[PDB]
Amino acid sequence: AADPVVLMETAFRKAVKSRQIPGAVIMARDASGNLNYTRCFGARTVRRDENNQLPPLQVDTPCRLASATKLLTTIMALQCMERGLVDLDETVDRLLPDLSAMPVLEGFDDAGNARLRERRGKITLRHLLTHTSGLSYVFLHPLLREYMAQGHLQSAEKFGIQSRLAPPAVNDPGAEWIYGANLDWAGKLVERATGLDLEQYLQENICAPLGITDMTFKLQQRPDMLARRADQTHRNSADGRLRYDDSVYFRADGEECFGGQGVFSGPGSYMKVLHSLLKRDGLLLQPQTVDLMFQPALEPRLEEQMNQHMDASPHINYGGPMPMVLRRSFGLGGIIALEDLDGENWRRKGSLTFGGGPNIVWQIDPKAGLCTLAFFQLEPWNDPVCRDLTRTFEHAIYAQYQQG
DSSP conformation letters of 299-344: -HHHHHHHHHHHHT-TTT-SS-SS-SS--EEE-SSSEEESS-EEEE
Contacts of residue 111, defined as CB under 8 A and 6 or more positions apart, other chains included, come to none
Listed as own residue / partner, the contacts of 220-225 with beta carbons closer than 8 Å and 24 or more positions apart are 220/254, 220/255, 221/255, 225/62, 225/264
User: Using the 8-state DSSP alphabet, how is residue 207 labeled?
Assistant: I
Q: Considering only CA atoms, which of 331, 295, 298, 328 is closest in space to residue 311?
A: 328
Residue 187's H or E segment, with its range, is helix 182-194
What residues form DSSP beta bridges with 28? 37, 372
Question: Residue 213 sits in which domain range?
Answer: 1-404
Give residues with Cβ within 8 angstroms of 351, minimum separation 6.
294, 336, 337, 341, 363, 364, 365, 366, 367, 368
64 is in an annotated binding site: yes
* Amino acid letter for position 195: G
Q: CA distances (Å), 260 to each of 12, 190, 319, 393, in order?
A: 30, 13, 18, 27
Query: Residue 6: how many CA atoms within 13 Å on its side-chain side?
Result: 3
Report the distance separating Cα 134 and Cα 119, nearest Å. 9
Instruction: Please give the Cα distance from 364 to 228 (Å, whole number).
Output: 29
Question: Which helix (H) or strand (E) covers residue 193, if one does?
Answer: helix 182-194
Quickly count: other Cβ atoms within 10 Å of residue 156's Cβ.
Answer: 15
DSSP 246-296: -HHHHHT--S---SSS--EE-HHHHHHHHHHHHHT--SSS-HHHHHHHTS-
3-state secondary structure at position 215: strand
Cβ–Cβ contacts within 10 Å for residue 372, how many? 26
- Nearest in space to 261 (alpha carbons), one of 357, 143, 163: 357
Residue 318, marked binder: no
Determine if residue 119 is labeled as part of a ligand binding site. Answer: no
Radius of gyration of the chain, Cα coordinates, nearest whole angstrom: 21
Q: Is 346 annotated as a binding residue?
A: no
Q: Are the C-beta atoms of residues 373 and 229 closer than 8 Å to each other? A: no
Q: Which has the closest alpha carbon to 38: 265, 375, 352? A: 375
186: nearest Cα among 46, 59, 332? 332
Instruction: Report which DSSP code applies to 377.
Output: -
- Measured CA to CA, the distance from residue 401 to residue 404 in angstroms comes to 8
Which residues carry out catalysis? 67
**Whose CA is closest to 350, among 330, 373, 320, 321?**
330
Please tell me what DSSP assigns to residue 156. G
Q: CA-to-CA distance for 189 and 125, rounded, in angstroms?
A: 9
For residues 392 and 385, give the distance between their C-alpha atoms in angstroms, rounded to a whole number. 10
CB contact at 8 A, 67 and 253: no
Instruction: Collect all residues with Cβ–Cβ distance below 8 Å to 54 and sequence separation of at least 6.
Output: 22, 42, 43, 45, 46, 47, 48
Helix, strand or coil for residue 108?
strand
- Gap between the Cα atoms of 210 and 218, Å rounded: 19
Technique used to solve these coordinates: X-ray
Q: Who's near 109: CB < 8 A, 6+ residues apart?
A: 115
Whether 30 and 231 have beta carbons less than 8 Å apart is answered as no
End-to-end CA distance of the chain: 13
Is 357 annotated as a binding-site member? yes
Report the domain count for the chain.
1
| Strands, E assignment, 65-214 | 104-108, 114-117
- 3-state DSSP call for residue 111? coil
CB–CB of 86/348 below 8 Å?
Answer: no
**From the DSSP assignment, how many helices (H) and strands (E) are in the chain?**
14, 16
Cross-strand partners of 27: 38, 373
Q: State the amino acid at position 327 in one-letter form.
A: R
How far apart are alpha carbons 150 and 141 in whole angstroms?
Answer: 14
Rounded-to-integer distance, Cα 390 and Cα 322, Å:
10
Answer for the pair 123, 89: CB distance below 8 angstroms, yes or no. Answer: no
33 is in an annotated binding site: no
Rounded CA gap, 46 and 362, in Å? 24
How many whole angstroms separate alpha carbon 373 and alpha carbon 255?
A: 27
CATH of residue 71: 3.40.710.10
Are residues 22 and 16 in contact, defined by beta-carbon separation less than 8 angstroms?
Answer: yes
Resolution (angstroms) stands at: 2.5
Up-side HSE of residue 221: CA atoms within 13 Å toward CB?
Answer: 9
What number of CA atoms fall less than 13 Å from residue 192's CA on the CB side? 14
Name the residue among 289, 295, 265 with its Cα closest to residue 356.
265
